[PDB]
Amino acid sequence: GMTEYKLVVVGADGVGKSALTIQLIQNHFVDEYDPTIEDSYRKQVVIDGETSLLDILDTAGQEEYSAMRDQYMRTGEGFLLVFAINNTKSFEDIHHYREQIKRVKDSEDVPMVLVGNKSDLPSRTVDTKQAQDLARSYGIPFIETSAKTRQGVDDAFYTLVREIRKHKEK
Amino acid sequence: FLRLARPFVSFICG
Ligand SMILES: Nc1nc2c(ncn2[C@@H]2O[C@H](COP(=O)(O)OP(=O)(O)O)[C@@H](O)[C@H]2O)c(=O)[nH]1
Ligand SMILES: [Mg+2]
Numbered sequence: 347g348m349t350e351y352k353l354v355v356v357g358a359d360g361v362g363k364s365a366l367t368i369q370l371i372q373n374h375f376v377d378e379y380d381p382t383i384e385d386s387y388r389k390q391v392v393i394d395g396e397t398s399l400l401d402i403l404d405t406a407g408q409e410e411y412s413a414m415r416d417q418y419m420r421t422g423e424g425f426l427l428v429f430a431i432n433n434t435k436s437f438e439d440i441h442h443y444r445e446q447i448k449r450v451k452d453s454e455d456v457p458m459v460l461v462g463n464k465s466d467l468p469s470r471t472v473d474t475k476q477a478q479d480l481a482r483s484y485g486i487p488f489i490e491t492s493a494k495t496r497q498g499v500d501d502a503f504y505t506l507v508r509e510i511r512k513h514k515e516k
Numbered sequence: 517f518l519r520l521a522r523p524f525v526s527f528i529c530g
Contacts, residue, residue, distance in 0.1 A: 356520065405520070408518055408519065408520055409517050409518065409519060410519055411519050411520075411521065411522055415520055415521055416521055416522060419520050419521035420521065439518075439528050442518050442526050442528040443518065443520070445526065446518060446520050446521075446524050446526055447520065449524055450520065450521045450524060
């Protein structure tokens, strides 16, 4: 059969939320995508042999509420917490995103994956160890990606799907 | 600020 999964991609402006989502749904890198566009995108993939329908909200303008986020923050099953490896402030923001999602969900167990994007760049400011340790403090996976080269993109989304599957078994 | 959903708000710009 199949399973549908509602995913929400969050993180600072410019970390590559749109580039990651577009690499997942269209299999190419789009280097210029309006930073104000917040929308949901549907994509059918196969994960571990099962047909999987992904309904992904690519968030934007997160300093204000939106009706799309009011709907997906409540119904969303899993979240990708994205930072850029060359942006310290985007990594420093991560704990704020997790804390707020936990309050929205009223739960200490919300499926999440930490994503360190832009792994192709030469001037990283966030060491992989700091991100691995932060993910370990939350009990969640950490995946290094590059939306530019497609490195780790399917792994980030599929790992989040695996985290949701485990949560649903409870 | 960060306002992902009502009625939460976090000041993350400081
Ligand atoms: N080098 C590189 N640039 C990226 C990557 N992901 C996104 N970008 C660039 O970073 C900028 C912000 O990307 P975008 O997807 O719009 O970010 P968003 O604001 O989180 O949706 C754009 O100029 C993208 O081309 C990546 O993995 N590597
Ligand atoms: Mg975007």
